[PDB]
Amino acid sequence: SMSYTWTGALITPCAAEESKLPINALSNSLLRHHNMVYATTSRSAGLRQKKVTFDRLQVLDDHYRDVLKEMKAKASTVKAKLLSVEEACKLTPPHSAKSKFGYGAKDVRNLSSKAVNHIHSVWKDLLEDTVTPIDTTIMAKNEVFCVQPEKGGRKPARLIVFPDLGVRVCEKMALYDVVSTLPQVVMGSSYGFQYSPGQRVEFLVNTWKSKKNPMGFSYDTRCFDSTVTENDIRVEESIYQCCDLAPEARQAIKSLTERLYIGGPLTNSKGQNCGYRRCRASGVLTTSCGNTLTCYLKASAACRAAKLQDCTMLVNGDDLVVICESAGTQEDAASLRVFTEAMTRYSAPPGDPPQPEYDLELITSCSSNVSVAHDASGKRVYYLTRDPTTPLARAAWETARHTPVNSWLGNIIMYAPTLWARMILMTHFFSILLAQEQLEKALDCQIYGACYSIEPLDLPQIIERLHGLSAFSLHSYSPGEINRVASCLRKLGVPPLRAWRHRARNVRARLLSRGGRAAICGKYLFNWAVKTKLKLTPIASWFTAGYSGGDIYH
Ligand SMILES: *[C@H](c1ccc(Cl)c(Cl)c1)[C@H]1SC(=S)N(NS(=O)(=O)c2cccs2)C1=O
């Protein structure tokens, strides 16, 4: 069936959309080539619609059925419970999209009588009706990127599809425990959201080292969400139903699946009918969990179809990486085509064909790659990094404009050991926080799709817990890593690393002259900036599951 059917109505914005990076002194000091940074708007929604709209002709075989059977057996050992209205309300983000029925996120969090009543009303309706399609709103996402000349074009806006606030709260009650616990049990070590960056690198390196002749490859599915069929979503539900669930949990899950998850009507911000969806909605609680289960199922089946030897998969939603035993270059190339053939039959054709890689550092999975550096004692330390172009583009944007999104803070947290996060992001932002006396202002940022309120002054502690003390002492980075960073800085017009060192020393001194956590930030975060190193002694739920598009607030 067609992933989408459109009426002709346009995907419209609900407010003014900023598309260009304003000339701002603060952002300019970080990145000069401001014309290279842009934000996607609804004006390119049409280009996105054209790409995500196509016919899926799914064909399943025994391998697919064998894997599915095994997955259901693991799901049978899981017990999940319903969340109370109160529990679901507290997981609702303070600025979540308000309901069209006269109440908002704040009312939900406060448990206003009006919010709680409509919530119950929606819940009761889910139990009474398991057929009538639930309405959803379709919007173009506003995200920031750097222009890529070689691509021959700007990236079209992504489309987000989500149901009303009342429906979102009900999703939490019926499935939050399921999506938070079931994935890890069904996919074991292959489930990527159970790992912190360091644990992920650990898993990748150990897996790679466990092979005699290692070979690995990432598999990029073209428009994954659109490739997810009604049957995929129903198979997903059968997996959820294998759990030990309360009577009305099953009813609610069946209802949400048939009325929302398998598809439904699309309505723009103006209230007009844009069309119909018959694929995954990016904006529901089960998106991450469903996508990971579906990607895992199809990939596992495809590994067997391609007869890959001693396969190990790591899956994060639609992101997939496989490490196995090489059979020769020509044979590996042939095996990958068979793998792709199977994935294609299962309704998951590639964007870029997968390519066998024989060097772990050259495998990009989930926009990242393992790399190596050395700690104070010269000991080899592996860590996750990525091309810094997008993080930097977004950092500049967030510096010049007030955004509820603080990707820069998430980037520092997840990529703390990188030279770019340490020398550039830390330096730039602590310098601004000092200037604005905002060192104590908590900021919201997403980690594995969930929203957290984080204080910048708690970075040292956070980083030590996630990456170990070595994150503050890494040096002797790889030539590959060093060149990618340098290359990125020239392209964007970001001051050279040596210029950041001078700024860091200044920022470091100012932090040490301040009290408590501030001195700890100056000492630990910027020890790399001074020749006379200080002694970095140990400082005296984030990675359990994915929730992208799930409207979760922790
Ligand atoms: C890829 C990904 C997966 C795992 C790790 Cl450890 C990294 Cl660094 C990246 C996607 S999955 C996902 S959700 N996601 N957001 S996040 O990992 O929470 C980050 C937030 C700020 C920087 S990374 C990814 O990037």
Q: Which of helix, strand or coil describes residue 276?
A: strand
Give the residue whose CA is nearest to atom 5 of ligand 1: 197
- Annotated binding residues for Mg(2+), written as ranges, equal 220, 318-319
C-alpha pair distances (Å), 529 with each of 26, 265, 466, 532:
22, 56, 22, 9
| 88 closest CA partner among 113, 105, 100 | 105
Pocket of ligand 1 contains residue 200 by CB under 6 Å: yes
Give the residue whose CA is nearest to atom 19 of ligand 1: 447
Pocket of ligand 1 contains residue 410 by CB under 6 Å: yes
Pocket of ligand 1 contains residue 221 by CB under 6 Å: no
Tokens linked to 214: 């290692």
Tell me phi and psi for residue 196, to 5 degrees. -90, 165
Alpha-helix residue ranges (DSSP H) falling in 401-516 = 407-414, 419-420, 427-436, 459-467, 479-492, 497-512
Burial class (CB within 10 angstroms; exposed 0-12, middle 13-18, buried 19+) of 333: middle
Pocket of ligand 1 contains residue 391 by CB under 6 Å: no
Pocket of ligand 1 contains residue 368 by CB under 6 Å: yes
Pocket of ligand 1 contains residue 93 by CB under 6 Å: no
Q: Which of helix, strand or coil describes residue 357?
A: strand
Give the integer Cα–Cα distance in Å for 265 and 48: 18
What's the per-residue H, E or C state across 421-445? HHHHHHHHHHHHHHHHCCCCCCEEE
Give the residue whose CA is nearest to atom 24 of ligand 1: 366
Q: Which of helix, strand or coil describes residue 215?
A: strand
Domains and CATH numbers, the chain: 1-55+133-163+263-278 (no CATH), 56-132+164-191+229-262+279-285 (no CATH), 192-228+286-368 (3.30.70.270), 369-554 (no CATH)
- Amino acid sitting at position 180: S
Give the integer Cα–Cα distance in Å for 465 and 416: 11
Pocket of ligand 1 contains residue 305 by CB under 6 Å: no
CA 133 to centroid of ligand 1, rounded, Å:
32
Strand segments (E) across 197-258: 214-219
Neighbours of 490 (CB within 10 A): 10
Give the residue whose CA is nearest to atom 13 of ligand 1: 448
User: After what residues is the chain interrupted, C–N > 2.5 A?
Assistant: 540
Distance of CA 284 to the CA centre of its chain: 14
Tell me phi and psi for residue 71, to 5 degrees. -65, -40
What is the resolution in angstroms? 2.1
Give the integer Cα–Cα distance in Å for 47 and 174: 35
Give the integer Cα–Cα distance in Å for 202 and 358: 18
Give the residue whose CA is nearest to atom 8 of ligand 1: 414
Q: How were these coordinates obtained? A: X-ray
CA 447 to centroid of ligand 1, rounded, Å:
7
Tokens linked to 545: 């599951």
Element (H, E) at 551: none
| 414 closest CA partner among 211, 200, 145, 252 | 200
